[PDB]
RNA sequence: UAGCAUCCCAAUAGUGAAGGGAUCUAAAACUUUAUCGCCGGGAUCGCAAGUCCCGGU
């Protein structure tokens, strides 16, 4: 039923691919058995067959009288309703009707009611063949397979087409396949009309009359090996719920167009697989744990190769507008960016060297990690160079640069000091009673993250310590009201000690972690894992943990209940439980000591040309890498880099703190704002002092301000209006999330509400208020302009990634071809440099999408993952598209019926739109 | 293909290949303004999103 990832011998079993073989083996031990597991899984092969015999509504008298007959030690009416036979015996020289056994389970049920050996014997024969063939699969399921069938097809085909021969003759092998007839067999069984069932039924038929000339060659074998891929992909006979199947699946012309792109989709795969293989110089050599090894390398990469995208899309926007080289600099443009950027400015005479070291800082990472292989990795952090008509050699740490640094450096405590009081905790926490955290002996502020790979956010650990305290002995987790100012400045202040305070040390720290997964482990008595040792470190124990939670969601749970003891038990060790009981109202002396020498500043910059949401993941990518890593020095590399990352994002939202003298003035800052006024909500009480928009003065930094100036330009009457601002003072928001957290207590109280229509309209209406007030909020403050500009960059990115994909599988099959259509090439230059925010190409999000599906059309892999992309991109943002038919809009994927994900209230009537219906609007004039 | 994608192996060709595997492929899961009850079970959808009973606040 299941060979891998079950628990045998209290350990888990997985399958590990050699060059040559190929094995079953245990969690942790190389020696390659596949005989041990195949005895062992006599129970879940008899688990299998009692599956088989029994349909798919298994009643549990029949069930047990099966397993009873079945197995001796679990010894203890109508047969064909819940039944789901001529066999031959293993042991069978030839097949013929001598040896033609039977199998009629239903007349044996009957007899012995009127009352099974024959019955034993067919159930230890099946058993024996399916280990066997099991067996078999796992022995030749080789990395590169040479002698199998299959793979000496494919190898064949490589041949072919690193020469100029066509593979695959199609027509041909179709011809003297007889797929006329199979077709025309297919077509009639189906208008005949379990469909499924029978068309397999007559496929098994075609296969049975032509197997005399498809046993031999395997050119037939393949295509009949596709042939039912093909059945099962459109007429499922197990996935009986994926659709209706039409007749035009079954017509000869597509059928044979589908089978071709199959076997040309196997062809590319195979040789991108050796190219991999030839650039890791791995070829002699592959195993499960090489190939591992290779993926996390290859992931951690592909992020770095996204982060580094970004840094260079910044530099253009920086430098050159338009672009695909420095002459051309606008020099007023490129000193704005620069000072939103470094929070600083920088003079003229400055321009070129810090446009050039930002070059230098960017460009050198990108090739040193596009190119595969095992590099230094503290020479590749590095980085002291930077390039200067003539090209000349200064450092780093002679430029703006390193001053720029040192006074991030120092800042540090000013910027967490500054976010603190703009987050509010200081107006409720005292000076004195909140100093007390920063100087804890041994949780000084850190600004990396943690070396665990899969770091929960104080978001889900939050939650679900509010929801495991109301035995897990949570005392912290409590007042999960968020309307309440309080708990707003609470969360905060939690956030921020959660982020740069406890992980640091709780991760570089091997006895808090210990303890908390021994607690957590220890409570509900996860039983697949096991307690680590004293000197265990942390990072890799929990390396290993998240590694079996991707093989195999109990893991998850696992891990946010670690870190949710973990906190709890820090906060309340470390007399911090002060701050779960806010009460609103010096300074406040910040320990911040980090090991950074001018080395760091290139990965600073970076970084700081990056969002914030694009620097988590990297950081996050970096983790995973690190604890994949096995060495002390790129070890601290990694940590030097992820106190970068923190850097970055501590001083990523700095933003701007100007009046109308940031823009040009006055006018100019009109003309750019109202695009997207002098009362209250966008200029202060004089009318003088228009404060500037984080959301305007983010897109003017990350260069989505042509784009989105663009979309908002498509009608003058969509951006703020009397309406909106009106909305406002119609009723007061806290109060209305407070009826409707009144209104949930009740139906929580007592679910008979959601049947009363009186009561179940109010909470709608309720609903609806607060997701018009939310809207109109985000509206006045411009949170859309920022969630509109999240969007398109998360799309970029993801577009990005893809073609990180594209150009490592191009570098691959290039690399293999040198050992043995330039579209493509110019929409990577139009979609991984971000030439969408510059726009001259001027091509749509979807138009983008679909000539990412155009380029990663050599696999369907990523054919499909590219169309997914921009679905689950949508709906994590809060809404649901629903793509068109492709073939009726000319393979450009369009949009239909672009909803707000209805996030449901009480498989009721009544339901909270995610995101509003005007931004569902928003989303679609972006789009299109 | 739009939820189940993709690739590898698998010859008693009705023991249905109607098999197994994938950190070996790629999504995705993870990832610093929060309007969804949570935990602990059972049952059942090819399982997946989810569905129905059953319980404590």
């Given at each position: 039923m299941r060979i891998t990832k079950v628990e045998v011998d209290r350990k888990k079993v997985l399958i590990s691919r050699?060059?040559?073989?190929?094995?079953?083996?245990?969690?942790?031990?190389?020696?390659?058995?596949?005989?041990?597991?195949?005895?062992?899984?006599?129970?879940?092969?008899?688990?299998?067959?009692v599956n088989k015999t029994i349909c798919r509504p298994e009643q549990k008298q029949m069930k047990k009288l099966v397993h009873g007959l079945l197995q001796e030690n679990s010894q203890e009416l109508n047969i064909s309703n819940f039944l789901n036979l001529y066999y031959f015996p293993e042991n069978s020289p030839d097949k013929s009707e001598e040896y033609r056994i039977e199998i009629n389970l239903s007349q044996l049920l009957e007899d012995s009611l009127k009352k099974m050996e024959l019955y034993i014997n067919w159930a230890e024969n099946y058993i024996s063949s399916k280990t066997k063939l099991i067996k078999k699969s796992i022995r030749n399921?080789?990395?590169?397979?040479?002698?199998?069938?299959?793979?000496?097809?494919?190898?064949?085909?490589?041949?072919?087409?690193?020469?100029?021969?066509?593979?695959?003759?199609?027509?041909?092998?179709?011809?003297?396949?007889?797929?006329?007839?199979?077709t025309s067999a297919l077509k009639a069984t189906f208008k005949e009309a379990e469909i499924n069932y029978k068309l397999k039924s007559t496929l098994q038929n075609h296969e049975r009359q032509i197997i005399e000339e498809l046993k031999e060659n395997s050119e037939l074998n393949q295509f009949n090996i596709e042939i039912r891929k093909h059945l099962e992909t459109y007429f499922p006979i197990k996935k009986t719920n994926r659709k209706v199947g039409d007749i035009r699946n079954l017509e000869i012309g597509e059928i044979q167009k589908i089978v071709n792109h199959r076997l040309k989709n196997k062809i590319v795969q195979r040789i991108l697989q050796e190219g991999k293989l030839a650039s890791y110089e791995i070829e002699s050599t592959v195993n499960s744990n090489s190939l591992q090894k290779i993926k996390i390398e290859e992931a951690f990469a592909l992020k770095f190769i996204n982060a580094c995208l970004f840094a260079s899309n910044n530099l253009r926007n920086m430098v050159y507008p338009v672009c695909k080289s420095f002459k051309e600099i606008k020099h007023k443009k490129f000193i704005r960016q620069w000072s939103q950027f470094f929070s600083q400015e920088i003079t003229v005479d400055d321009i070129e060297l810090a446009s050039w070291g930002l070059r230098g800082a960017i460009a050198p990472i990108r090739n040193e990690i596009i190119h595969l292989k095992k590099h230094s990795w503290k020479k590749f952090f590095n980085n002291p160079t930077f390039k200067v008509d003539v090209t000349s050699e200064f450092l780093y740490k002679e430029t703006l640069f390193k001053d720029?640094?040192?006074?991030?450096?120092?800042?540090?405590?000013?910027?967490?000091?500054?976010?603190?009081?703009?987050?509010?905790?200081?107006?409720?926490?005292?000076?004195?009673?909140?100093?007390?955290?920063?100087?804890?002996?041994?949780?000084?502020?850190?600004?990396?993250?943690?070396?665990?790979?899969?770091?929960?956010?104080?978001?889900?650990?939050?939650?679900?310590?509010?929801?495991?305290?109301?035995?897990?002995?949570?005392?912290?987790?409590?007042?999960?009201?968020?309307?309440?100012?309080?708990?707003?400045?609470?969360?905060?202040?939690?956030?921020?000690?959660?982020?740069?305070?406890?992980?640091?040390?709780?991760?570089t720290n091997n006895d808090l972690f210990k303890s908390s997964v021994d607690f957590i482990l220890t409570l509900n008595k996860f039983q697949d894992i096991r307690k680590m040792n004293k000197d265990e470190k942390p990072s890799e124990y929990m390396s290993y943990i998240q590694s079996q939670l991707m093989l195999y969601n109990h893991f998850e749970k696992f891990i946010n209940q670690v870190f949710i003891k973990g906190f709890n038990s820090?906060?309340?060790?470390?007399?911090?439980?002060?701050?779960?009981h806010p009460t609103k109202n010096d300074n406040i002396e910040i320990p911040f000591h980090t090991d950074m020498d001018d080395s760091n500043i290139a990965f600073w910059l970076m970084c700081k040309l990056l969002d914030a949401k694009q620097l988590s993941e990297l950081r996050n990518e970096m983790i995973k890498f690190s604890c994949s890593l096995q060495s002390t020095e790129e070890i601290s590399t990694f940590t030097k880099a992820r106190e970068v990352i923190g850097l970055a994002l501590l001083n990523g939202e700095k933003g701007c703190n100007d009046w109308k003298e940031?823009?040009?003035?006055?006018?100019?800052?009109?003309?750019?704002?109202?695009?997207?006024?002098?009362?209250?909500?966008?200029?202060?009480?004089?009318?003088?002092?228009?404060?500037?928009?984080?959301?305007?003065?983010?897109?003017?930094?990350?260069?989505?301000?042509?784009?989105?100036?663009?979309?908002?330009?498509?009608?003058?009457?969509?951006?703020?209006?009397?309406?909106?601002?009106?909305?406002?003072?119609?009723?007061?928001?806290?109060?209305?999330?407070?009826?409707?957290?009144?209104?949930?207590?009740?139906?929580?109280?007592?679910?008979?509400?959601?049947?009363?229509?009186?009561?179940?309209?109010?909470?709608?209406?309720?609903?609806?208020?607060?997701?018009?007030y939310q809207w109109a909020k985000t509206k006045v403050e411009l949170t859309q302009v920022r969630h509109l500009h999240?969007?398109?960059?998360?799309?970029?990115?993801?577009?990005?990634?893809?073609?990180?994909?594209?150009?490592?599988?191009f570098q691959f099959s290039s690399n293999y071809i040198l050992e043995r259509d330039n579209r493509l090439k110019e929409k990577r230059n139009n979609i991984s440099h971000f030439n969408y925010l510059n726009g001259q190409l001027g091509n749509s999000i979807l138009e983008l999408f679909?000539?990412?599906?155009?380029?990663?059309?050599?696999?369907?892999?990523?054919?499909?993952?590219?169309?997914?992309?921009?679905?689950?991109?949508?709906?994590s943002h809060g809404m649901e598209v629903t793509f068109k038919p492709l073939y009726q809009t000319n393979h450009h994927l369009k949009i239909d019926k672009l909803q707000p994900k209805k996030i449901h209230h009480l498989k009721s009537t009544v339901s909270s739109n995610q995101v509003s219906n005007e931004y569902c609007q928003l989303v679609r004039t972006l789009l299109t």
């Open positions: 050699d060059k040559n073989g190929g094995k079953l083996v245990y969690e942790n031990e190389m020696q390659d058995n596949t005989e041990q597991i195949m005895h062992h899984k006599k129970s879940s092969f008899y688990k299998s067959v399921n080789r990395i590169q397979s040479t002698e199998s069938r299959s793979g000496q097809l494919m190898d064949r085909y490589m041949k072919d087409i690193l020469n100029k021969n066509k593979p695959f003759d199609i027509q041909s092998v179709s011809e003297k396949y007889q797929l006329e007839k199979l720029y640094f040192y006074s991030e450096l120092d800042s540090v405590p000013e910027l967490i000091i500054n976010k603190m009081e703009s987050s509010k905790i200081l107006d409720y926490y005292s000076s004195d009673q909140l100093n007390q955290v920063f100087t804890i002996p041994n949780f000084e502020l850190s600004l990396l993250t943690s070396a665990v790979p899969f770091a929960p956010s104080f978001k889900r650990v939050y939650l679900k310590g509010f929801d495991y305290q109301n035995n897990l002995k949570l005392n912290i987790y409590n007042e999960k009201a968020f309307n309440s100012e309080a708990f707003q400045a609470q969360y905060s202040l939690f956030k921020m000690v959660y982020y740069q305070v406890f992980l640091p040390q709780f991760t820090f906060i309340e060790k470390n007399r911090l439980t002060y701050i779960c940031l823009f040009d003035d006055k006018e100019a800052w009109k003309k750019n704002m109202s695009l997207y006024l002098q009362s209250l909500p966008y200029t202060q009480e004089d009318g003088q002092t228009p404060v500037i928009n984080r959301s305007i003065d983010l897109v003017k930094k990350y260069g989505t301000e042509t784009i989105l100036e663009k979309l908002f330009s498509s009608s003058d009457d969509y951006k703020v209006s009397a309406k909106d601002i009106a909305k406002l003072h119609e009723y007061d928001v806290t109060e209305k999330i407070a009826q409707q957290e009144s209104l949930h207590k009740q139906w929580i109280e007592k679910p008979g509400l959601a049947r009363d229509s009186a009561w179940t309209k109010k909470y709608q209406n309720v609903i609806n208020d607060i997701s018009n999240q969007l398109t960059i998360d799309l970029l990115s993801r577009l990005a990634g893809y073609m990180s994909i594209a150009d490592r599988d679909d000539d990412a599906r155009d380029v990663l059309s050599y696999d369907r892999k990523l054919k499909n993952a590219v169309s997914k992309s921009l679905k689950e991109i949508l709906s």
